[PDB]
Ligand binder design. Sequence first.
Ligand code: ZN
Lengths: 132, 83
Amino acid sequence: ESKRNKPGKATGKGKPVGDKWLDDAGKDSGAPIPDRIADKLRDKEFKSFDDFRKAVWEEVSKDPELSKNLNPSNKSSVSKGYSPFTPKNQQVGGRKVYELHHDKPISQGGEVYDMDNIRVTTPKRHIDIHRG
Amino acid sequence: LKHSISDYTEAEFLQLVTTICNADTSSEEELAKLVTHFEEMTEHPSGSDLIYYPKEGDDDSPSGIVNTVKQWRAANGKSGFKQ
Ligand SMILES: [Zn+2]
């Protein structure tokens, strides 16, 4: 049914981020996967892309520099492996949480679990990217 | 029970907000549905920001959020909680 449902191992370096990490998600190509998260997930095997996504948010929940910039309610969400809610103005209808985006699309041969090919986006930004 | 905020006593409304704040749900989808419901009940222009992106000095504990909604509704000409 879909290529993102085949198991794979996470790879890639990610990038240094700061306190403004999630503000970057609503601009340009989105925010990168933090180097710190990539270090935690590298070489692990994932059953599906959705399983990888859960893993990212769980590592954010445990990361002091990354979680400090989420409120108590959003913290509860990422502790469950749920994606955190964005500000209202970056939501589009039922799409209300940060979304993981492939920079080179999988449909175009991009790698599913290469963290250097993954970006964090708001719903508003992500939709616009795929509309050209 | 669930059609407008006037169908909630203050205590029941606190229980809803507590469930959202603690992500006390079976799936991400169920949580998102609950947050949408909250926004429809309050009719507050800030929407889910009341839960996740409080204004400076605003108390984002469940009791704090309930207070902010109760005061906003009262100040802006709208009906309040049952009883
Ligand atoms: Zn995408």
